[PDB]
Amino acid sequence: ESADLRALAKHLYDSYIKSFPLTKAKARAILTGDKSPFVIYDMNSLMMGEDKIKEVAIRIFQGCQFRSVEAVQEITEYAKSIPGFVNLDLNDQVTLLKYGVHEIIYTMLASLMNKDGVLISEGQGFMTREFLKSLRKPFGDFMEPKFEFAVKFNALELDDSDLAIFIAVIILSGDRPGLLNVKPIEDIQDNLLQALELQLKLNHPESSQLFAKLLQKMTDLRQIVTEHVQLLQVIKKTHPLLQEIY
Amino acid sequence: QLNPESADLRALAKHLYDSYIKSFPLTKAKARAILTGKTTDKSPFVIYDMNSLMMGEDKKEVAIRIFQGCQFRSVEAVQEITEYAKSIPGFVNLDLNDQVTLLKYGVHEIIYTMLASLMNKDGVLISEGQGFMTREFLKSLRKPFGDFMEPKFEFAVKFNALELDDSDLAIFIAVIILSGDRPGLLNVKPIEDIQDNLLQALELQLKLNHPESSQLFAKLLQKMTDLRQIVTEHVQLLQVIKKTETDMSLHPLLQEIYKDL
Numbered sequence: 001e002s003a004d005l006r007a008l009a010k011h012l013y014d015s016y017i018k019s020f021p022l023t024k025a026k027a028r029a030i031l032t033g034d035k036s037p038f039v040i041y042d043m044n045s046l047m048m049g050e051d052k053i054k055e056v057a058i059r060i061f062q063g064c065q066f067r068s069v070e071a072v073q074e075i076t077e078y079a080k081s082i083p084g085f086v087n088l089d090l091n092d093q094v095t096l097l098k099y100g101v102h103e104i105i106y107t108m109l110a111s112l113m114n115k116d117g118v119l120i121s122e123g124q125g126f127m128t129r130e131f132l133k134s135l136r137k138p139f140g141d142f143m144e145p146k147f148e149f150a151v152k153f154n155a156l157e158l159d160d161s162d163l164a165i166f167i168a169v170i171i172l173s174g175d176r177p178g179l180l181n182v183k184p185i186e187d188i189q190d191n192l193l194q195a196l197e198l199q200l201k202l203n204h205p206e207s208s209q210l211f212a213k214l215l216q217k218m219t220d221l222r223q224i225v226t227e228h229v230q231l232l233q234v235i236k237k238t239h240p241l242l243q244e245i246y
Numbered sequence: 247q248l249n250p251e252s253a254d255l256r257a258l259a260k261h262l263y264d265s266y267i268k269s270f271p272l273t274k275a276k277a278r279a280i281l282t283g284k285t286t287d288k289s290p291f292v293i294y295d296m297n298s299l300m301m302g303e304d305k306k307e308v309a310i311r312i313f314q315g316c317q318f319r320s321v322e323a324v325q326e327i328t329e330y331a332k333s334i335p336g337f338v339n340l341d342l343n344d345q346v347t348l349l350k351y352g353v354h355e356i357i358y359t360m361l362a363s364l365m366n367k368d369g370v371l372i373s374e375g376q377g378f379m380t381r382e383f384l385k386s387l388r389k390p391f392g393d394f395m396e397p398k399f400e401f402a403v404k405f406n407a408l409e410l411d412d413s414d415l416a417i418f419i420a421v422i423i424l425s426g427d428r429p430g431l432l433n434v435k436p437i438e439d440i441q442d443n444l445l446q447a448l449e450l451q452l453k454l455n456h457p458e459s460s461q462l463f464a465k466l467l468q469k470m471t472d473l474r475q476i477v478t479e480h481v482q483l484l485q486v487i488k489k490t491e492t493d494m495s496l497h498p499l500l501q502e503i504y505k506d507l
């Protein structure tokens with residue numbers, strides 16, 4: 001048992017590294033100790049950042065969308081490396097990605113966040129929490145709850161090897177609506193959960209019940225996603241091919 | 247056997263086939279099974295005249311109604327193609343303006359490539375394969391509507407002789423989207439680097455899938471000139487329609503695609 005699992009963990013770490021350029025380890029190095037990122041903390045600072053790297057709030061939102069669309073392709077590539085994933089019914093793969101990417105985006109965004117701001121543009125920029133929060137409604141309230149989640153998530157002190165398995169657990173959720181064959185999805189998730197548990201026991205022997213605590217974070221994640229989607233709807237009180245891409 | 251480099255190309259081929267099946271709900275495989283009688287469950291209702299057309303409805307003017315139907319389907323196809331385009335590695339990382347440009351010039355060449363899958367020399371599948379409208383009925387519509395589809399049929403018959411399957415088409419459609427010689431492109435190099443890779447993958451795919459088909463790769467690439475000619479002829483036909491039929495509406499997505507094409 002405890003060998004297929006080590007294999008699974010290593011396999012997923014290696015694939016996570018290929019798929020996601022900006023790892024947590026590299027993000028934390030930048031957020032602390034070498035060559036500093038460009039800090040966007042103001043309206044004038046944002047203006048200059050676009051030279052270095054509609055009005056203002058709209059351009060920032062549209063930027064997050066371009067990045068999210070990129071991230072969806074990175075996550076999809078990652079998914080296809082999870083053993084058993086490509087052997088699932090194709091409708092079910094599409095369903096799992098459709099309902100999983102938002103949860104994964106915000107999980108991974110926490111790797112680029114501290115309590116004072118978030119890394120952007122592959123770590124070249126840093127947009128402050130206070131700047132994002134100052135944006136006029138409804139655009140001032142879209143990142144804040146991701147910051148509150150991130151602070152709580154980051155207290156677990158997970159590393160990229162832990163996160164690789166956790167992301168996979170998220171993708172293989174058998175409770176997504178419209179799934180046709182739930183059995184093999186839950187069978188794969190069981191194996192991934194086993195791998196995650198062992199990974200966290202070996203990697204974090206002094207953090208009691210880290211496995212449990214990580215799983216409980218799924219509750220705040222789905223909350224964040226549901227309220228985000230409702231903000232996206234409210235956004236409909238504010239180029240044809242361009243809107244098609246998004 | 248295969249080597250590391252040709253192995254990466256196979257993975258690319260498989261990724262693109264997989265995304266094609268997820269993005270396009272009516273494949274060539276399904277279209278051929280409907281057209282060739284692999285069926286008591288999948289046979290289409292045939293529209294060959296006005297009364298057939300009437301009877302087909304439970305499933306103004308006839309020429310305009312069919313034309314409005316094509317427009318609508320064209321808008322759907324653009325949505326499907328745009329979703330496919332996102333899956334092509336590197337595409338979403340390109341400059342946003344270039345993504346729009348590649349789609350603008352790409353989508354119709356792709357629409358007509360895939361339309362061939364739904365066609366034989368006698369007609370075309372419609373309404374997700376539930377109906378089949380004859381080439382003769384379409385050709386009989388009052389001018390200039392009777393001219394719209396004939397060039398698509400001529401191309402299709404010649405294109406279908408290549409006997410490409412969906413795994414082949416998936417890489418070819420990607421090659422179409424990622425052309426660095428589209429007008430107005432800001433950053434050509436990254437586009438060409440992606441197409442290089444796509445071309446290598448198409449080439450190997452055609453060698454493996456059709457080993458007895460000499461220069462299929464070259465012959466398929468040559469067909470890109472036919473697609474371009476179809477697009478241009480089609481656009482000149484729409485300008486005539488827009489002027490003779492002041493009461494007919496062209497969808498803004500389609501209008502933006504054609505704007506200064």
Ligand SMILES: CCC[C@@H](Cc1ccc(OC)c(CNC(=O)c2ccc(C(F)(F)F)cc2)c1)C(=O)O
Nearest residue numbers: 312313315316317319320357361370371372373500
């Ligand atoms: C004016 C609209 C013409 C299109 C070109 C076009 C796009 C898609 C097409 O179908 C895949 C076609 C050919 N039309 C059909 O196959 C078709 C015909 C009738 C119907 C309908 F009757 F069901 F509506 C649906 C599709 C043309 C364009 O210029 O964008």
